[PDB]
From a paper:
By combining microcrystal electron diffraction with native mass spectrometry (ED-MS), we develop an approach to rapidly and accurately determine structures of biosynthetic or clinically relevant ligands bound to enzymes. We demonstrate this approach with the model protein lysozyme bound to its noncovalent ligand N,N′,N″-triacetylchitotriose (ACT), then use the cysteine protease papain as a scaffold on which to bind a panel of both known and potential inhibitors, including the epoxide-based covalent cysteine protease inhibitor E-64 (27), its commercially available chemical analogs, and analogs generated by biosynthetic reaction. Last, we extend the ED-MS workflow to interrogate crystals of the β-lactamase enzyme, CTX-M-14, which imparts resistance to β-lactam-containing antibiotics by hydrolyzing their four-membered ring structural motif.
We next interrogated ligand interactions of the cysteine protease papain, as isolated from papaya latex. Mass spectra acquired from apo papain crystals harvested from a TEM grid showed masses corresponding to the protein with both a doubly oxidized, sulfinic acid form (+32 Da) of its catalytic residue Cys25, and a reduced form of the protein.
Numbering used by the authors: 1 to 212
The structure:
Amino acid sequence: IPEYVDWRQKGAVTPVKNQGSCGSCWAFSAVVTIEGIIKIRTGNLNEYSEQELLDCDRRSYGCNGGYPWSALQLVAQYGIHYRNTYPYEGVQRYCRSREKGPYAAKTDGVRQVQPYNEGALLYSIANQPVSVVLEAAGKDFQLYRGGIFVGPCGNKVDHAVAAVGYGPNYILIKNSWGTGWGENGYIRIKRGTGNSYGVCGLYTSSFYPVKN
């Protein structure tokens, strides 16, 4: 795999979103991997509905948090609508997939990256954007304004984001806190420290959709 990967330069990443007060990061995370894999397989970049996952993933807890892998299984099992037809409201409502007509896209499954393995994650990122989790509650992460983030942070992961790239000394993360946070909405997190958790627990739980 190359020294540098940036799925934004291959046009597989849509604009940075803001999840708002809602703890819907798990849905935003899952969506950017869906947006990535559909662009990689069909050449078409579309935005898909975080709100639909928010409303429809019964295993997750809406704005109280949830599981990227459950959201990803939902899209594998049923499908997902365009963001335009099912826009983000920042509040869990009822599942309205059936009122929105046919699904815009479907995936074929979900795989977990082998946990606590930096190489395994990098290999997956070289293939497609990956849903990863990290500890975002620390003030240093929240006040991140740019550069390669090394912490401080622990491993109490609490926030789902998407890895969309990497370089020799970092992994490139799309956050869902709007374009004003970090590097126009992104954070580069140090890799290669030999801590098997990853910086801020980044290697704890990583998932990507499969599309044949």
